[PDB]
Amino acid sequence: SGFRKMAFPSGKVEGCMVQVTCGTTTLNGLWLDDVVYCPRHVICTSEDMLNPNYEDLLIRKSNHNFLVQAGNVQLRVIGHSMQNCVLKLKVDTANPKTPKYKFVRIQPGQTFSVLACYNGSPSGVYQCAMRPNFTIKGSFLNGSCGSVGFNIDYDCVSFCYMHHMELPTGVHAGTDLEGNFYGPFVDRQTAQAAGTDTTITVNVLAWLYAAVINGDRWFLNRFTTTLNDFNLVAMKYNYEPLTQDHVDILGPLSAQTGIAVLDMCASLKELLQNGMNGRTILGSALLEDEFTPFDVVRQCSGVT
Amino acid sequence: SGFRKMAFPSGKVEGCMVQVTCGTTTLNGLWLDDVVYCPRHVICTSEDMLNPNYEDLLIRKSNHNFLVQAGNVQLRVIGHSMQNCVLKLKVDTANPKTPKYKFVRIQPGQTFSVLACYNGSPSGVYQCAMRPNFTIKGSFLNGSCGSVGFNIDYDCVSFCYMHHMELPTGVHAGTDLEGNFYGPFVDRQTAQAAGTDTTITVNVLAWLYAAVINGDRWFLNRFTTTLNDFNLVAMKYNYEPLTQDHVDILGPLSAQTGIAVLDMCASLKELLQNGMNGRTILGSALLEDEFTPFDVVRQCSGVT
Ligand SMILES: *[C@@]1(O)C(=O)N(Cc2ccc(OC)c(OC)c2)c2c(C)cc(Br)cc21
Numbered sequence: 319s320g321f322r323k324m325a326f327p328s329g330k331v332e333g334c335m336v337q338v339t340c341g342t343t344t345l346n347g348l349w350l351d352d353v354v355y356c357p358r359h360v361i362c363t364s365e366d367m368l369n370p371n372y373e374d375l376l377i378r379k380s381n382h383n384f385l386v387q388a389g390n391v392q393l394r395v396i397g398h399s400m401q402n403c404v405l406k407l408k409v410d411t412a413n414p415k416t417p418k419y420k421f422v423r424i425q426p427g428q429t430f431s432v433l434a435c436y437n438g439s440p441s442g443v444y445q446c447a448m449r450p451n452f453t454i455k456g457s458f459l460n461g462s463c464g465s466v467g468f469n470i471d472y473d474c475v476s477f478c479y480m481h482h483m484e485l486p487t488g489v490h491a492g493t494d495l496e497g498n499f500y501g502p503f504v505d506r507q508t509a510q511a512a513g514t515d516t517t518i519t520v521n522v523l524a525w526l527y528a529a530v531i532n533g534d535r536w537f538l539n540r541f542t543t544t545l546n547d548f549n550l551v552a553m554k555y556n557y558e559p560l561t562q563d564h565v566d567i568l569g570p571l572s573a574q575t576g577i578a579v580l581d582m583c584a585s586l587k588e589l590l591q592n593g594m595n596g597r598t599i600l601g602s603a604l605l606e607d608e609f610t611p612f613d614v615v616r617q618c619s620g621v622t
Numbered sequence: 623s624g625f626r627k628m629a630f631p632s633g634k635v636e637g638c639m640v641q642v643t644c645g646t647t648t649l650n651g652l653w654l655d656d657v658v659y660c661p662r663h664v665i666c667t668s669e670d671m672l673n674p675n676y677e678d679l680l681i682r683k684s685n686h687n688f689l690v691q692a693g694n695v696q697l698r699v700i701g702h703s704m705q706n707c708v709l710k711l712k713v714d715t716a717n718p719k720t721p722k723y724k725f726v727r728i729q730p731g732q733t734f735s736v737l738a739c740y741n742g743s744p745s746g747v748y749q750c751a752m753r754p755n756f757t758i759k760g761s762f763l764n765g766s767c768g769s770v771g772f773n774i775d776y777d778c779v780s781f782c783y784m785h786h787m788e789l790p791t792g793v794h795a796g797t798d799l800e801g802n803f804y805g806p807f808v809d810r811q812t813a814q815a816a817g818t819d820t821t822i823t824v825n826v827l828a829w830l831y832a833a834v835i836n837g838d839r840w841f842l843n844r845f846t847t848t849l850n851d852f853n854l855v856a857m858k859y860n861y862e863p864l865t866q867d868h869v870d871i872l873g874p875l876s877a878q879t880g881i882a883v884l885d886m887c888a889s890l891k892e893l894l895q896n897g898m899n900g901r902t903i904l905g906s907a908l909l910e911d912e913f914t915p916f917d918v919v920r921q922c923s924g925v926t
């Protein structure tokens with residue numbers, strides 16, 4: 319029992335972190351097989367980042383200009399190329415610590431672990447979610463670029479995120495491992511609007527099921543609702559519309575607890591319309607949306 | 623920017639997790655050098671755990687009765703001994719993945735990372751605190767015993783906690799790595815009272831400084847207080863008394879932000895007497911006490 323914001327064990331990812339230097343800029347790289355992946359803004363200077371011509375800036379760089387260091391061993395760069403907003407540096411040695419891995423593009427509302435790194439060295443790991451507006455509310459300082467987000471399925475690391483920038487609003491933006499930005503963001507120091515964010519409804523409901531499984535039941539009520547009535551409420555409180563797909567993915571939690579999805583929706587509707595009244599759920603005084611139904615199932619069953 | 627409940631990278635600890643089996647009981651062990659550390663209740667059956675005579679139960683066991691498995695390789699047990707509530711199994715091979723390590727007994731209010739494990743396999747990592755009442759509000763299921771709590775200072779892993787049991791109130795109890803329980807707990811299925819818990823005052827104030835450093839300033843006020851007046855308030859709201867030592871440890875945060883400790887105490891006093899009024903601080907609607915001044919400094923400076 320107990321419910322925590324749990325990250326994946328970061329070991330398999332720690333073994334991939336390297337330091338990438340290009341001119342005077344240093345950030346983190348991801349060494350998988352004989353390729354080092356890092357944000358392409360590593361080739362920029364402060365002046366360049368206003369409106370950089372990446373193709374032109376990369377043309378002034380040769381393999382020997384990219385200094386890749388794994389811990390304290392230098393890697394020999396034999397090739398370089400840009401794919402969207404990432405640089406792929408071919409090294410002459412395959413990472414002996416390369417775990418089994420996939421590159422996956424996550425959907426908004428999905429969660430992942432972040433291994434924050436500085437100078438190629440890991441500093442901390444935390445669990446977060448891709449916000450519906452394609453930002454992540456992480457903890458990143460200058461030097462953290464190239465830190466990655468990932469999930470782990472038994473022995474396979476699915477890399478989903480690479481950190482590229484901080485928005486003026488303190489939220490974070492980045493790409494998948496093919497260099498495609500999540501959201502409308504570009505790797506420039508320009509005016510960039512993070513869209514309207516909403517609350518991940520299916521995740522809040524999954525967290526309400528995690529609360530019941532752990533003893534926090536005060537919010538359960540004598541009411542039910544319909545998907546349409548619940549969606550009027552979710553719309554009013556800037557919550558994502560709940561779909562039949564979301565209802566279906568809550569099925570195992572509904573079966574374990576014996577609480578129908580629509581009955582749990584009526585609890586959430588009452589919590590939205592009335593607040594917590596100075597009470598807590600799983601040690602939180604707000605409605606938590608960074609646990610998916612899969613995360614709740616995994617944590618509550620003990621998947622390793 | 624951004625502030626997260628961050629755990630240490632778990633890699634160095636993942637390399638130490640093994641599975642320990644004794645008869646029909648399986649739990650986790652910690653393999654450091656040629657010694658495997660695990661909770662001594664591994665030698666018990668459900669009937670034994672009412673009032674077990676550990677000395678007598680250990681006498682019915684030989685080196686060959688302790689089955690230690692590291693991933694999928696069997697370790698040869700050449701010695702066994704009990705130290706307080708832990709079993710130390712001498713194996714014929716030193717763990718090649720043994721990081722630089724220390725065994726430390728943490729103080730109440732101090733924080734640490736937990737690597738939750740089942741069958742010797744890591745499932746997740748989270749940050750938590752040793753509660754003033756010597757319990758931890760973790761996330762542990764049956765099979766998690768032997769999971770460890772740790773801190774990391776550059777390359778050194780300081781092991782502080784080993785998980786032994788769940789209290790009827792869903793909170794967790796365990797020992798340091800010498801087998802000494804934190805708190806009044808014993809490794810028996812008996813009536814065990816977790817004392818009165820209080821809020822870690824210095825940690826809440828450290829988290830208020832983390833909020834100011836990150837933009838959340840609404841709670842700052844035009845007031846100041848004295849240590850004695852603040853302590854009357856802390857006493858009323860079941861908060862730990864603030865000491866001059868706590869004031870001193872908040873010094874670097876006081877210097878960075880330019881907000882005197884007693885001025886921040888007056889903000890906390892107003893928050894305690896008036897509540898949040900439906901507002902949030904670092905994405906939380908309650909006063910967070912699981913970040914020490916050292917954790918805030920580390921996260922806000924970028925220590926790897
Ligand atoms: C990351 O470590 C950086 O290299 N970095 C500098 C930077 C990143 C991105 C952009 O524009 C898209 C600019 O524009 C000038 C600079 C940086 C910063 C500043 C913040 C964080 Br958090 C991580 C990184």
Ligand SMILES: *[C@@]1(O)C(=O)N(Cc2ccc(OC)c(OC)c2)c2c(C)cc(Br)cc21
Nearest residue numbers: 671762763764765766767787788809810811
């Ligand atoms: C841990 O993995 C266990 O082995 N385990 C069983 C258990 C532990 C401790 C005690 O008494 C002190 C008893 O008494 C019967 C059984 C267990 C349990 C039940 C819960 C959690 Br969480 C972890 C572990």
